[model samples]
Target: LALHKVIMVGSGGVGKSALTLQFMYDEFVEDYEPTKADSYRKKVVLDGEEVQIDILDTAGQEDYAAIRDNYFRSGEGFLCVFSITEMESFAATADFREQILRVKEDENVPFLLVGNKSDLEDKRQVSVEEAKNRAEQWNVNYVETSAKTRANVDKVFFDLMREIRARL
Candidate 1:
């Protein structure tokens, strides 16, 4: 079976690349190159059934209008991840939802809104309820994940897949 694709969107340093590495490889890159560019593809599977996923880690700093427009054409699942420790990450979610709405031809296209970096709750600048409220406003399912402890990490990914499968 062909693999499904998922794009990870959020502000820079909000752990988009980290979450991708953690989910796909089970480890973290100690020193991450601050993303100022477009994407990288990664693969994952369900029951060893190969699935190809483009981990679209977009530029969170500048106006990546050219590249951002392309993702709309792809029309796949989206994981709009935000960091619990960064309010800006959460704040930008509204814009992210707008981008998805603009690109996604299917209004009911499934998306997984994630609040990442649960491991650093001590420094959390955004609350879970607020995130959930935003998610409700966007009409997508939400979850919090931690790559450090692997806390609810797999569950979030798989659950999103479950929702996708149900729709199919």
Candidate 2:
């Protein structure tokens, strides 16, 4: 099986689970509990290749800062997520990126800086330009997704795989 490994990292309550669930099942959860160490797998065709994608959905770094071994060296790509409604979560994305690069010691790792909760247009705390500018500075692509609406849900995952398999 040709597989690509992806890890989801962000602050708690940033719709990480929502995105994962939607991507895996096409079902939206309104009151889902937080996930720390759940693994979800899907087989999808990428460029005419049936590839198995293993996505490890983990706890937010804000509280589960206790375990780095699980986070250590675990991904070909990482989806750094944040809610548009919370500035704290947006700020946490940077911390997550730093920790990943710090632990992996690989500057060339594939990355996607995600702004979740795109459906909440009026309540956004992290503006769109702010995110794009941050990502531009990071040399990483910034994508806004709404797991609630399924907007860009597939695009983010697929684009990440493209970036990763290009290297593989």
Candidate 3:
């Protein structure tokens, strides 16, 4: 099987853990607990080919910025997660992008700008237009995901893997 390293980055409450867990276990965790983990491994069929996608979840790594940046170079693709319900979370993606760009030193790296918490559209604070504009400025694809409802949860990971495979 092929191995792909994916790293999750964004604000602390943006549901990176939830998305990772949703993609890994195919279930949504409702607890508000803060999970401390380094990585998750799952064997998945990407476009009919079996591949191992390893995701680095930086949950508490929020406060550990140094430790967070340390994993950037090791990642094949980045899931830049942000909560659509919070405009602050969406604004915070710039710094994460800054760090990743610094480490990767390349514009064509496999990166996805993910707007999570789509199920809470009633509480939406960030507009799709603004998110898409940011993504367009970054020159990367943007996807909306709802870990609570499992919408586009798999697409983010699979699409990112496909881009990584393209680079490989």
Please identify which of the two predictions, 1 or 3, would achieve the higher TM-score against the true structure.
3
Q: Which residue pairs does candidate 3 place in steric collision?
A: none
CA lDDT for candidate 3: 0.89
Off by over 4 Å in 1: 36-50, 61-66
User: Model 1, range 1-168, lDDT digits (tens) per residue?
Assistant: 555656777777777777777777888754667755446555567556666655566656545777667865574677888889989888887787788888875656768888988989899999888888877876788899887777877776666665566664
- What is the TM-score (0 to 1) of candidate 1? 0.84
Question: What's the lDDT for residue 96 in model 1?
Answer: 78
lDDT of 3 at 92: 89
RMSD of 3: 1.6
User: lDDT per residue, candidate 3, 1-168, as tens digits?
Assistant: 999999998888899888988888888976646767668998899999999999988875355656666778889899999999989888889988998998889988999999999989899999999999999998999999999999999899999999999986
Clashes within 3 Å, all models in order: 2, 0, 0
Residue 4 Cα positional deviation in candidate 2, in Å, after optimal superposition: 0.4
lDDT of each: 0.74, 0.87, 0.89
Which candidate model has the greater lDDT, 1 or 3? 3
List pairs with backbone clashes in candidate 2: none
